[PDB]
RNA sequence: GAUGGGGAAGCUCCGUUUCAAAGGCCUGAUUUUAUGCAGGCCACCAUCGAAAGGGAAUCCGGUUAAGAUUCCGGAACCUGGAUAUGGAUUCUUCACGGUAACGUAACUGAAUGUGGAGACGUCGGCGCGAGCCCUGGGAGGAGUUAUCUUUUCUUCUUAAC
RNA sequence: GCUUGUGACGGCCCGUGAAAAUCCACAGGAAGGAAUAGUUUUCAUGCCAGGUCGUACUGAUAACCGCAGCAGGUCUCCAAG
RNA sequence: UCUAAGGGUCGGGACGAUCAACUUAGAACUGGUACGGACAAGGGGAAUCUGACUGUCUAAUUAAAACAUAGCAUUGCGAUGGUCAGAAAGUGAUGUUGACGCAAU
């Protein structure tokens, strides 16, 4: 039955005025301003939300230790690792198949 | 803003550096199922955080109050 | 037809279906020949290719999709790669293959 | 007396294109050594919707020849171009849907899109959804190419001018009935302020030429000469004919 | 039970707009919503959004299509006249 | 054939060593009570040696040749067999079930594998194994 | 909307990266000495424009005739800067571990390139959270009580971090 | 249950629904770095600083606009049985 | 004043024990025949004229049959262009555009 008011001079229901309602040690209801829920980062290859990485808003990532912001494998805080596994097979196979094609020139060179 | 388990670490904290003041709280608390018991809380005011140690039984408590050095100004309750 | 050979391999012979198992075959070498559905991606092609050259297993490219090469084994789903384990009654590998 | 609506438009207070949401200005690669001599490869990264455009867009990233960096371009996606396809640019690229070749480097009968009017202008003709041009013959001496445009007119251009194989995606939009005003409303929300239109005869003669009268009527021939004057020109303007078109179209 | 004799997806427009236009739309709304087979992963998980743009539910392949259907007549009959045209310069 | 055998080089496809080339040593074709699955035992290269050039000085080359190894149990499924091969030799005894489970053996094992790889690298025997795979 | 510019008798009009020689930083090199020369970068070219858009960080209790997320008591947080001790790293120099997904109290990184977050419609049902609503036991307080009603009402709370 | 937040989904489009500051990370390998000891601030603990302007109250059948303590007009949050 | 149906959670060397709700239907009895008891809450039908429709306008005498719309048709234009702006410009709108486009009826 208690009714509550905003705590900041913005009266309007915008993104930045989100309000949690709370009961304090006083025993009364009081508004409290919530920030905007920060979004999980995305693998820059596939786009899926990449695990092992803490999800905060971007200037919070400067206040946190690095074992949050990467994971132990190459391209740790970047790609989703089935996509890095992709970069593994594809790299190797393409750099291999290159030699085959450099060989097969050296055949058709003097064998044409 | 932190709670402490280790009794030893607590001691190295009570003598630590910039810690000029501590405090000790005593609460009536009912043990386990039935009875009451004397709970005692050790609060050490650090330059950043207030570390606090809860000694459940008064035995470890009684001997720890002695473990507190002088020049640490300890408000009793 | 190249499809009808599989009809015999399937009833009278031994086979496995799908990439994860057709690598296990080529690794253990248990596969004589694997067949690839035309639409499957080239990274998987090169892999299944390169896994085969290391196992000295021939590979024929099925002209068609996975929903077809799956019907061609008489199974109601799609399959990209069939690994031929034990040739059946059919002539199979001794062929154009 | 007054200033008629089409007159007011060249000032562009309210009449400017509604531009905020648009992916960018869709253009070809700049013509450089690679394209005019060899080929160069890029992957279309994603294909995407432009606002106020009927055609989808392909974002195509290439590598920068003279500096290490990736240079992304905005192409009008021809139909069948897909994310992850490699696109090839310039003369020695092969002839496949989506690549970009000089007009000289294709045979006659090729159907090609976003072609330049002059070589290097980064593309002009047939950028609308579903449109395209056809090459009819070349003239290897003073290398020229004749092409049939979407309007049907045929044009001589330079064979160094490029254009991209295939047809633009998103063909068929103009068949589906708009079916109500809202669909027409939002259609022009993201275009420019053209809608709706008030009929010049519904107005008063200060407002329009067609304005005025105790009956709604035009009162003089609605066809207006080329040599007419600003605020005289509203109607069928320099019309060579008029009336319902009977018989076939498709000129020579 | 079957619900509408004729209108189908067009029953949304009720009585409005006249029957021709309603049907004339019905064809294209049914074309544009359909699930289509995917040239890549071989599944019927292709579907539209943003006319001219068709993606696969899985496999995430995305192809520039027709407005209300994936492959438009003029497209493929252009594409095959391209195939035939390069063979000339293959041979 | 069965390309899983001693000398074979592979590329690790996962697990923090991903992208680095390992040589197999002790393939266990089928399982174990711990690791019930087909797994090799590989001596890999973690930190590759760097590029060297005619103008690279005395200790510069003495620095740039150092090589950080690693010794890993690998699921076969997490290996990508390369056609290339490097003959095990000195580390046949080094890399074993016993070496793992206690660090003291791994550390010395890595020490051997260290001297092993550098020695084969200088005098560029098996050039591919020390050329970093880049992706 | 300044500027090199181009119009205009002129008040001024146009143009905002435009026919423009459009600069600013990281390090050394000084050991005349304070900062010239050595590089290699980067060429991205005013500025104004949101007290509802974007955005670094605080809460509870108490207090005034009137002020409070501003004072007071207590417990925090961000940013800029200074810095010392512990811990960690290494004779295999730049941490180990798990098959893997990943773990972690740390666990060097310049030019340059890339990736993510800033960062985004609407409607529908379905899941969950807080706060509000109803309510049983008991512990207090107040009301009704000719009759009735283990009854009516009320307190039973928990902030950021 | 009601307010509100959030999640995974589905419908809709010839509509497919901002920008920038900013912050983190990946790639790379310049360079610098140990043994009588060298390395580190993305771990812990500690030391200093945080200016300038606004902050009262009305916000409406009397504190605003309509000549007024005018039945008009003026954006929004909370919402018990 | 009753009856019936519609659930949760347990353990198994055929069911039992247990927690929790306000829906629905049915049956009795009962009354000054009353009962959506206040409040709340469509009048219905047949036709002619006219605009298809939702939408719009004369603030302060007109809300309509007038405007708009989807739809139908017609006209101009391939950029050295159409339409349109400025006293002029080395200036501008359409135009982040290109005939499935823009402009004019
Ligand atoms: C006692 N509280 C802390 C004290 O522990 C210490 O904390 C620093 C902290 O400020 C640094 O953090 C700071 O610097 C980072 C970049 N170097 C970015 C984030 C920023 N908060 C930490 N990286 C290291 C701590 N020892 O220095 C700052 C402080 C506030 O005095
Ligand atoms: C724009 N709405 C107008 C509204 O302004 C008003 O118009 C009157 C107009 O009729 C009166 O004018 C009338 O009477 C005048 C005196 N006999 C002469 C002109 C005649 N039109 C003028 N006094 C102006 C408006 N207040 O009433 C008529 C209207 C059309 O509704
Ligand atoms: Mg306030
Ligand atoms: Mg309050
Ligand atoms: Mg992590
Ligand atoms: Mg901190
Ligand atoms: Mg974590
Ligand atoms: Mg006039
Ligand atoms: Mg460009
Ligand atoms: Mg039509
Ligand atoms: Mg308008
Ligand atoms: Mg009209
Ligand atoms: Mg008209
Ligand atoms: Mg009139
Ligand atoms: Mg006139
Ligand atoms: Mg008239
Ligand atoms: Mg008329
Ligand atoms: Mg008329
Ligand atoms: Mg006239
Ligand atoms: Mg039906
Ligand atoms: Mg030299
Ligand atoms: Mg100016
Ligand atoms: Mg500003
Ligand atoms: Mg703001
Ligand atoms: Mg702030
Ligand atoms: Mg007050
Ligand atoms: Mg450690
Ligand atoms: Mg950078
Ligand atoms: Mg609301
Ligand atoms: Mg969307
Ligand atoms: Mg790195
Ligand atoms: Mg600690
Ligand atoms: Mg106030
Ligand atoms: Mg107030
Ligand atoms: Mg009033
Ligand atoms: Mg007043
Ligand atoms: Mg006044
Ligand atoms: Mg009755
Ligand atoms: Mg009645
Ligand atoms: Mg009546
Ligand atoms: Mg009636
Ligand atoms: Mg009407
Ligand atoms: Mg309505
Ligand atoms: Mg209006
Ligand atoms: Mg009126
Ligand atoms: Mg009306
Ligand atoms: Mg009609
Ligand atoms: Mg002219
Ligand atoms: Mg012109
Ligand atoms: Mg002209
Ligand atoms: Mg057409
Ligand atoms: Zn990924
Ligand atoms: Zn697919």
Short mmCIF file of C-alpha atoms in Angstrom, two decimals, chain F residues 54-130:
data_model
loop_
_atom_site.label_atom_id
_atom_site.label_comp_id
_atom_site.label_asym_id
_atom_site.label_seq_id
_atom_site.Cartn_x
_atom_site.Cartn_y
_atom_site.Cartn_z
CA UNK F 54 71.38 -12.74 -41.24
CA UNK F 55 71.51 -9.59 -39.09
CA UNK F 56 70.34 -11.35 -35.92
CA UNK F 57 73.18 -11.08 -33.42
CA UNK F 58 74.94 -13.57 -31.18
CA UNK F 59 72.61 -13.82 -28.19
CA UNK F 60 69.62 -12.71 -30.29
CA UNK F 61 69.72 -16.04 -32.12
CA UNK F 62 70.73 -17.66 -28.82
CA UNK F 63 67.48 -16.21 -27.48
CA UNK F 64 65.16 -16.69 -30.46
CA UNK F 65 65.92 -20.44 -30.64
CA UNK F 66 64.46 -21.27 -27.23
CA UNK F 67 61.34 -23.42 -27.34
CA UNK F 68 58.65 -24.07 -24.73
CA UNK F 69 57.31 -27.63 -24.92
CA UNK F 70 54.25 -29.39 -23.58
CA UNK F 71 53.24 -33.00 -23.05
CA UNK F 72 49.57 -33.78 -23.44
CA UNK F 73 47.06 -36.56 -23.36
CA UNK F 74 44.83 -35.92 -26.38
CA UNK F 75 41.58 -37.45 -27.45
CA UNK F 76 42.16 -38.71 -30.98
CA UNK F 77 39.08 -36.65 -31.91
CA UNK F 78 40.98 -33.55 -30.77
CA UNK F 79 43.91 -34.31 -33.10
CA UNK F 80 44.13 -33.50 -36.81
CA UNK F 81 46.68 -35.90 -38.33
CA UNK F 82 49.29 -34.29 -40.56
CA UNK F 83 50.91 -36.32 -43.34
CA UNK F 84 54.25 -35.12 -41.93
CA UNK F 85 56.26 -37.22 -39.48
CA UNK F 86 59.04 -36.65 -36.93
CA UNK F 87 60.81 -39.67 -35.43
CA UNK F 88 60.43 -39.90 -31.65
CA UNK F 89 63.82 -41.39 -30.62
CA UNK F 90 65.11 -39.79 -27.37
CA UNK F 91 61.67 -39.19 -25.82
CA UNK F 92 60.35 -42.75 -26.34
CA UNK F 93 61.12 -43.31 -22.63
CA UNK F 94 60.33 -39.72 -21.57
CA UNK F 95 56.65 -39.50 -22.51
CA UNK F 96 54.66 -42.19 -20.71
CA UNK F 97 51.68 -42.84 -18.48
CA UNK F 98 54.05 -42.57 -15.52
CA UNK F 99 55.33 -39.12 -16.50
CA UNK F 100 51.82 -37.74 -16.06
CA UNK F 101 49.97 -37.86 -12.69
CA UNK F 102 52.95 -36.35 -10.95
CA UNK F 103 54.46 -33.00 -11.92
CA UNK F 104 58.04 -33.88 -10.99
CA UNK F 105 58.28 -36.24 -13.98
CA UNK F 106 56.48 -33.91 -16.41
CA UNK F 107 58.84 -31.05 -15.54
CA UNK F 108 61.98 -33.10 -16.22
CA UNK F 109 60.24 -34.66 -19.22
CA UNK F 110 59.59 -31.20 -20.63
CA UNK F 111 63.27 -30.46 -19.95
CA UNK F 112 64.33 -33.40 -22.12
CA UNK F 113 61.73 -32.59 -24.77
CA UNK F 114 63.15 -29.07 -24.59
CA UNK F 115 66.72 -30.15 -25.38
CA UNK F 116 65.18 -32.65 -27.80
CA UNK F 117 63.29 -30.12 -29.93
CA UNK F 118 65.96 -27.41 -29.97
CA UNK F 119 68.63 -29.93 -30.98
CA UNK F 120 66.51 -31.17 -33.89
CA UNK F 121 65.56 -27.59 -34.78
CA UNK F 122 69.09 -26.21 -35.04
CA UNK F 123 70.36 -28.06 -38.07
CA UNK F 124 66.85 -27.71 -39.38
CA UNK F 125 65.78 -31.35 -39.38
CA UNK F 126 61.96 -31.49 -39.50
CA UNK F 127 61.44 -27.88 -40.50
CA UNK F 128 57.63 -27.97 -40.57
CA UNK F 129 57.22 -28.95 -36.93
CA UNK F 130 58.81 -25.67 -35.75
#
